[PDB]
Ligand binder design. Structure first.
Ligand SMILES: CCCCCCCCCCCCCCCCCC(=O)OC[C@H](COP(=O)([O-])OCC(O)COP(=O)([O-])OC[C@@H](COC(=O)CCCCCCCCCCCCCCCCC)OC(=O)CCCCCCCCCCCCCCCCC)OC(=O)CCCCCCCCCCCCCCCCC
Ligand SMILES: CCCCCCCCCCCCCCCCCC(=O)OC[C@H](COP(=O)([O-])OCC(O)COP(=O)([O-])OC[C@@H](COC(=O)CCCCCCCCCCCCCCCCC)OC(=O)CCCCCCCCCCCCCCCCC)OC(=O)CCCCCCCCCCCCCCCCC
Ligand SMILES: CCCCCCCCCCCCCCCCCC(=O)OC[C@H](COP(=O)([O-])OCC(O)COP(=O)([O-])OC[C@@H](COC(=O)CCCCCCCCCCCCCCCCC)OC(=O)CCCCCCCCCCCCCCCCC)OC(=O)CCCCCCCCCCCCCCCCC
Ligand SMILES: CCCCCCCCCCCCCCCCCC(=O)OC[C@H](COP(=O)([O-])OCC(O)COP(=O)([O-])OC[C@@H](COC(=O)CCCCCCCCCCCCCCCCC)OC(=O)CCCCCCCCCCCCCCCCC)OC(=O)CCCCCCCCCCCCCCCCC
Ligand SMILES: CCCCCCCCCCCCCCCCCC(=O)OC[C@H](COP(=O)([O-])OCC(O)COP(=O)([O-])OC[C@@H](COC(=O)CCCCCCCCCCCCCCCCC)OC(=O)CCCCCCCCCCCCCCCCC)OC(=O)CCCCCCCCCCCCCCCCC
Ligand SMILES: CCCCCCCCCCCCCCCCCC(=O)OC[C@H](COP(=O)([O-])OCC[N+](C)(C)C)OC(=O)CCCCCCCCCCCCCCCCC
Ligand SMILES: CCCCCCCCCCCCCCCCCC(=O)OC[C@H](COP(=O)([O-])OCC[N+](C)(C)C)OC(=O)CCCCCCCCCCCCCCCCC
Ligand code: FES
Ligand code: FES
Ligand SMILES: [Zn+2]
Lengths: 50, 188, 106, 75, 55, 49, 52, 57, 243
């Protein structure tokens, strides 16, 4: 947030985005660890109470 | 300007060469420096006139460069693909195109992204007379490219020496120490 | 808003031809400013996007008839490479080891 | 037909040099006729016949329009 | 290739690319847009995570 | 070449150089291809007539 | 701690997102190393209260 | 209404970036063509106050 | 409102109108300096005149009184934790305001450290100077400034030194002391700022002392006697010791 608000505006330091298309292949899998941990914690607590 | 002219007699000039040194003593493709004398100024400057300055030799980008026997200096600053080398088994007599820019998607070997990225670092085409395992450089700063020469350790040391790199490294260090301390103090 | 630039290029047949760079939109013809004046303002408002019912076109190129990229092709990875370089730290040349022993088999 | 192959290569080189000089640019590819065995049409890998050892290599301009004079002849 | 030449609609439905080569310069008379949903929404493509969750 | 039937302009769209892996060069950009001289796409330089 | 383990860091970034937020990600560790201490200590106190 | 992209939604190339910068600067100059310069504005702001009691230096 | 007559307001309006009508963009000047020797410009059409490593040569961490400021924080933290003064809830909570504000001056000092020019070049024509600086985070800022906008300060930094007779270069050519110069208008990151003070540390080599003095004093350098040296010894984003 700080970086975007301080430097990414046209006035300060715009960047020439030359990338045409995305190429991510497993970033979704890497990111889903955190929601995976959330689901694991929810399941554990719920089952322990049940 | 009287004071400046008076002091010019005792003023002395210093060389304009700094830590980067001279590229022609370390790059075979960099010609030795040459001084060009501008011609006399034009008495009449036509609106559609072209430069009369002497032409400078033009050296196109080579498709690939040979193996520099321990005297390799990349033309540009390459991307640091990795901080430790690749232990790759090379075949005897097979030509390999080691990646210099450091963005190749095929590993140590050139993938073609050098032609798509703005860089003067060209792939190094080399051959090996004895098959076996070799440590191919990944930081792309090795003087013995394409072969690793432990320059990645010095690159890591310089990153740690830099003010911001030190901060990043030790911030990650203390972040992990957070887990370590939580484990140590788990029982209370 | 009609053309963002123009150039004169001599084709392989020796004739000089004019090439105009059309103004473009991000996938949204609604955001596209359809005008016929050298003006940035969106003055013309059209109730019928396709007055004559002629369909628009999104040509698909045949891979066989494609040509190797040459329109600043060396800039495709420039953005990502420079973004990485901005934070990359480069060892000074003087401190960087040089003239190390040659590989025995190369 | 080695003679035919060499003649075709020479003709293609001369045509590329002439077109480059006319257009004030350089050839986009050095392939005489496009083929899809190499994915040069839709990948970064190119086919350019420009190789030299050092800045004083006489073969620096081989394969480029700078190797031909205004009469479209090798120098 | 036989499927593409004989029944272009079924080839497009299955997602096969145009198997003919137009290197001679004349475009083919039965080319079609690519329907790649089957080959893209797969465990081995961009829909890998969605297909893992669905599996 | 983009064909029109006695109309001055046509809404054209470009996605750049197409590749088998992705089938699209760059994100779709729409413009108005008008009758007259050749025109060019900023992103990839593709020439339309 | 991420891209460092990979010998093709450009591939790491491209295959994850084709986006570069490594600067912020690696700067955030310093702040995250201490932003949690009051919460952790109060949680220890609350756990002791629950145990009692 | 005026489009913010000025006909260049994407700066895929430095030539496009330069074209956008040139046109944007020209448009900004045109829009600022009707207001006083920095020196005039600063002097007016500095010497706006005119309410004193004694005069004659 | 205009019906109310005020001589001061009328004088202000007259002064503004007269200034606008008289002073134009094109301003004549006669402060042109012709160097005795021919100038050897780089392959890029620029001549280096100053080089230094301010980050390397400056103190970053243990700088007074910022160390005192940040060492006062634990006292406040302990006071809040143990309530030694037997204060109310709001009164004790007031003690936590200091730690949120005690590190700002060090941030400002670190920001100021980035205004120490790392390198300076003079462009062709002797009217533009490019100043290249770097911050502690590795960010590199290069800004071009017209030569007439420079104004040197005295050795004490509390006044403007006389441009004509300024004594800041030793006899051989180096800097007697860290020279401060105020630029009337500086364009940094595409943003113009007023009265920007910059410094040239004495611990920095000075190339072409005549050109450096002319740039500092604001003269326009005559570069008619120039030669071009083709030396591609510098790469983009080249590393340096100023980190
Ligand atoms: C309470 C604490 C108090 C502390 C107080 C203070 C103490 C102060 C201490 C000061 C000194 C500290 C030094 C820290 C160094 C940090 C910097 C650093 O190392 O980076 C420089 C480093 C330079 O590297 P290098 O030294 O030049 O080596 C490069 C070579 O390519 C590397 O390749 P290689 O040539 O080394 O090859 C390795 C291996 C390659 O083979 C393998 O694939 C490895 C596994 C082989 C099988 C082993 C079986 C046993 C179980 C292994 C389990 C893990 C294996 C995982 C494999 C995954 C494969 C996908 O070789 C083989 O082919 C197999 C050989 C097996 C022989 C068996 C020997 C006996 C058993 C031990 C085997 C260990 C093997 C290495 C494991 C490495 C991690 C995976 O810079 C980088 O590039 C950084 C990369 C990222 C690093 C991330 C990790 C950072 C931390 C590392 C240090 C760990 C210290 C932990 C101490 C804990 C104490 C509590
Ligand atoms: C009846 C039988 C039943 C059997 C059941 C199955 C057995 C049990 C499960 C086994 C699971 C194996 C999983 C690994 C698959 C390996 C695939 C493979 O062989 O690839 C061929 C691949 C390519 O072959 P190639 O083309 O012929 O090249 C050969 C060259 O020699 C290649 O040499 P190079 O120099 O080019 O590269 C080698 C190495 C050289 O570079 C490195 O070493 C890379 C990383 C370090 C760089 C810096 C070096 C300086 C020292 C760093 C120290 C780091 C300490 C901190 C480590 C992380 C925190 C613990 O670099 C790497 O391998 C890159 C890996 C980077 C990520 C490492 C992260 C490891 C995370 C797990 C740590 C677990 C620690 C447990 C400790 C327990 C005791 C306390 O070669 C290798 O990977 C060589 C190693 C062979 C595999 C050794 C596996 C050892 C056991 C791993 C256990 C992992 C944990 C358990 C997981 C599953 C159960 C929960
Ligand atoms: C059980 C109920 C039975 C009811 C019987 C009713 C009988 C009377 C029927 C009367 C109605 C007939 C017409 C139906 C039209 C429906 C609406 C529609 O879309 O029309 C479009 C149609 C034309 O519009 P359009 O936009 O051109 O249509 C485009 C297409 O629809 C294309 O649409 P799109 O672009 O959205 O395409 C999406 C598609 C495109 O993506 C794909 O290509 C799918 C993925 C393919 C590749 C997957 C590879 C995975 C990796 C390999 C396998 C890994 C596993 C391990 C094995 C391999 C190991 C190596 O992907 C998906 O969303 C499919 C999910 C894929 C997940 C695959 C998971 C497989 C795991 C196996 C278990 C789960 C299977 C679930 C089903 C899967 C799909 C068949 O609309 C009209 O003509 C106007 C509306 C007409 C409405 C008529 C009235 C409808 C009444 C419906 C009543 C239903 C009642 C029951 C509801 C609740 C049931 C639970
Ligand atoms: C919107 C407004 C409202 C907001 C509301 C609130 C928010 C709600 C949000 C909700 C949604 C959440 C979404 C979550 C997902 C977001 C994903 C996203 O956007 O980011 C994509 C972002 C993209 O990646 P990236 O962050 O750009 O990749 C760069 C790395 O992450 C960066 O790591 P790196 O390693 O590549 O770079 C740093 C590197 C830089 O360093 C290097 O590389 C240099 C080489 C290494 C060695 C350096 C040292 C060398 C020293 C040499 C010797 C010096 C002299 C000797 C001095 C000592 C001896 C005298 O450091 C190292 O490698 C070395 C560090 C070693 C420290 C650890 C050692 C611990 C032990 C130390 C002990 C010491 C004390 C002993 C005491 C003993 C007694 C107690 O993250 C992902 O890829 C997705 C992550 C998804 C989750 C999985 C996370 C794990 C996977 C890896 C990534 C983990 C970090 C990043 C996680 C993300 C957050 C920070
Ligand atoms: C006889 C008795 C015993 C002996 C006593 C004497 C002992 C010796 C004392 C020696 C020291 C004397 C003072 C030295 C001042 C040095 C100033 C300085 O650093 O200048 C260099 C440096 C030069 O930078 P520059 O860019 O050249 O110029 C400054 C810029 O203008 C940049 O300025 P700016 O635009 O940033 O504005 C200033 C200020 C922001 O502007 C202001 O605050 C304006 C000043 C008035 C604020 C208060 C408004 C009036 C109402 C207050 C009361 C409300 C009712 C009470 C309840 C509600 C309370 C909120 O900046 C900020 O703090 C911005 C971030 C906001 C803070 C983040 C946290 C927010 C929440 C908590 C704070 C809320 C606001 C403050 C509330 C204060 C009252 C509780 O200035 C700064 O770094 C800026 C100021 C930084 C903080 C200064 C204070 C540091 C601590 C000094 C005392 C240390 C000793 C403590 C123990 C004493 C007893 C033993
Ligand atoms: C009863 C009363 C008891 C009182 C006891 C008081 C104990 C006091 C203990 C002080 C310990 C000091 C440790 C740091 C020492 C640094 C030395 C030095 O200059 O090294 C330079 C050297 C030189 O490194 P370099 O040259 O490679 O690169 C860095 C160079 N600079 C910084 C100049 C850019 O650094 C090192 O090699 C690393 C040394 C260890 C660094 C440890 C960093 C800790 C960061 C802490 C951040 C804040 C949180 C603190 C609390 C939590 C800690 C887990
Ligand atoms: C929060 C506490 C720490 C939790 C750590 C959780 C991770 C535990 C280890 C997981 C190992 C398996 C990861 C599978 C996904 C990656 C597969 C892959 O790309 O492998 C090929 C890569 C090869 O990369 P490469 O770049 O050399 O080659 C690929 C490039 N091409 C395709 C061009 C050839 O191998 C690795 O580098 C394996 C890295 C394993 C470590 C995890 C990486 C993700 C980032 C987090 C690092 C955490 C380190 C933890 C250390 C152990 C702690 C106990
Ligand atoms: S050298 Fe790295 S891609 Fe060609
Ligand atoms: S990896 Fe480049 S020197 Fe070891
Ligand atoms: Zn296009």
């Amino acid at each position: 947030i700080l970086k975007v608000a301080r430097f990414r505006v046209l006035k300060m330091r715009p960047k020439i985005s030359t990338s045409y298309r995305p190429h991510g292949k497993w970033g979704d899998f890497l990111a889903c660890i955190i929601p995976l941990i959330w689901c694991i914690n929810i399941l554990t607590n719920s089952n322990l109470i049940l | 300007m009287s004071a400046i002219l008076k002091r010019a007699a005792k003023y002395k000039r210093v060389s304009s060469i700094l830590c980067e040194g001279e590229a022609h003593l370390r790059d075979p493709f960099t010609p030795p420096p040459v001084i060009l004398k501008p011609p006399a100024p034009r008495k009449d400057k036509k609106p559609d006139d072209i430069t009369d300055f002497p032409a400078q030799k033009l050296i196109p980008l080579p498709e690939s460069i040979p193996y520099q026997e321990g005297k390799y200096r990349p033309a540009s600053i390459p991307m640091v693909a990795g901080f430790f080398p690749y232990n790759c088994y090379l075949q005897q007599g097979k030509v390999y195109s080691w990646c210099s820019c450091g963005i190749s998607q095929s590993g140590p070997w050139c993938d073609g992204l050098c032609n798509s990225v703005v860089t003067r670092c060209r792939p190094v085409v080399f051959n090996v007379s004895q098959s076996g395992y070799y440590k191919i450089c990944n930081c792309k700063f090795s003087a013995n490219a394409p072969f690793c020469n432990n320059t990645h350790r010095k690159m890591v040391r310089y990153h740690h020496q830099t003010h911001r790199g030190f901060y990043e490294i030790w911030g990650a260090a203390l972040f992990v120490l957070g887990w370590v301390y939580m484990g140590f103090n788990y029982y209370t | 808003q009609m053309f963002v630039a123009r150039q004169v290029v001599t084709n392989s047949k020796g004739e000089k031809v004019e090439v105009l760079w059309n103004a473009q939109c991000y996938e949204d013809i609604a955001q596209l400013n359809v005008g016929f004046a050298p003006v940035l303002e969106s003055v013309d408002y059209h109730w019928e996007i396709f007055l004559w019912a002629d369909p628009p076109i999104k040509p698909n190129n045949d891979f066989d008839l494609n040509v190797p990229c040459t329109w600043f092709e060396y800039e495709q990875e420039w953005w990502m490479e420079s973004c990485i370089q901005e934070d990359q730290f480069n060892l000074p040349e003087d401190e960087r080891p040089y003239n190390t022993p040659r590989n025995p088999h190369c | 037909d080695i003679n035919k192959y060499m003649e075709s290569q020479l003709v293609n080189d001369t045509l590329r040099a002439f077109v480059s000089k006319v257009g004030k640019t350089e050839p986009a590819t050095w392939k005489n006729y496009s083929t899809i065995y190499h994915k040069d049409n839709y990948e970064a890998e190119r086919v350019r016949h420009v190789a030299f050892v050092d800045h004083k290599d006489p073969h620096m301009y081989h394969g480029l329009p700078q190797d031909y004079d205004d009469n479209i002849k090798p120098k | 290739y036989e499927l593409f030449v004989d029944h272009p609609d079924l080839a497009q439905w299955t997602g096969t690319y145009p198997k003919v080569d137009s290197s001679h310069g004349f475009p083919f008379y039965s080319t079609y847009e690519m329907y790649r949903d089957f080959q893209e929404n797969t465990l081995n493509s961009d829909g890998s995570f969605a297909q893992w969750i669905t599996l | 070449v983009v064909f029109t039937s006695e109309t001055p302009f046509r809404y054209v769209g470009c996605t750049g150089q197409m590749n088998e892996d992705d089938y699209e060069g760059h994100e779709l950009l729409f413009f108005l291809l008008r009758e007259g001289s050749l025109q060019r796409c900023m992103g990839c330089g593709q020439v339309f007539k | 701690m991420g891209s460092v383990w990979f010998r093709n860091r450009y591939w790491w970034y491209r295959s994850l997102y084709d986006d570069y937020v490594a600067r912020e990600a690696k700067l955030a560790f310093g702040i995250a190393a201490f932003i949690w201490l009051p919460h952790y200590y109060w949680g220890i106190h609350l756990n002791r209260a629950f145990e009692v | 209404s005026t489009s913010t992209t000025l006909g260049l939604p994407r700066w895929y190339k430095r030539i496009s970036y330069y074209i956008f910068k040139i046109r944007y600067l020209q448009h900004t100059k045109s829009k600022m063509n009707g207001i006083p310069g920095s020196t005039v504005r600063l002097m007016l702001i500095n010497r706006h106050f005119v309410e004193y009691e004694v005069y004659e230096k | 409102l205009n019906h109310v007559q005020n001589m001061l307001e009328e004088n202000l309006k007259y002064d503004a109108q007269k200034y606008n009508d008289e002073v134009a963009v094109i301003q004549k000047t006669s402060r042109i300096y012709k160097p005795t020797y021919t100038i050897e410009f780089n392959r890029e059409g620029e001549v280096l005149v100053y080089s230094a490593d301010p980050i390397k040569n400056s103190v970053v961490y243990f700088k007074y009184p910022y160390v005192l400021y940040e060492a006062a924080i634990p006292l406040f933290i302990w006071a809040w934790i143990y309530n030694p003064l037997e204060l109310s809830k709001n009164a004790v909570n007031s003690l936590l305001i200091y730690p949120n504000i005690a590190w700002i001056p060090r941030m400002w000092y670190w920001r100021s450290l980035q205004y120490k020019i790392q390198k300076m070049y003079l462009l062709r024509g002797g009217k533009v100077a490019k100043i290249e600086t770097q911050s502690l985070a590795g960010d590199r800022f290069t800004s071009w400034v017209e030569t007439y906008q420079f104004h040197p300060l005295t050795q004490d930094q509390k006044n403007f030194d006389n441009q004509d007779n300024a004594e800041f270069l030793e006899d051989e050519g180096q800097l007697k002391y860290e020279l401060g110069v105020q630029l009337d208008n500086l364009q940094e990151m595409g943003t113009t700022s007023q009265d920007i003070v910059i410094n040239f540390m004495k611990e920095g080599t000075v190339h072409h002392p005549e050109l450096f003095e002319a740039i500092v004093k604001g003269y326009n350098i005559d570069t008619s006697d120039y030669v071009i040296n083709t030396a591609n010894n510098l790469r983009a984003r080249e590393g340096n010791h100023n980190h």
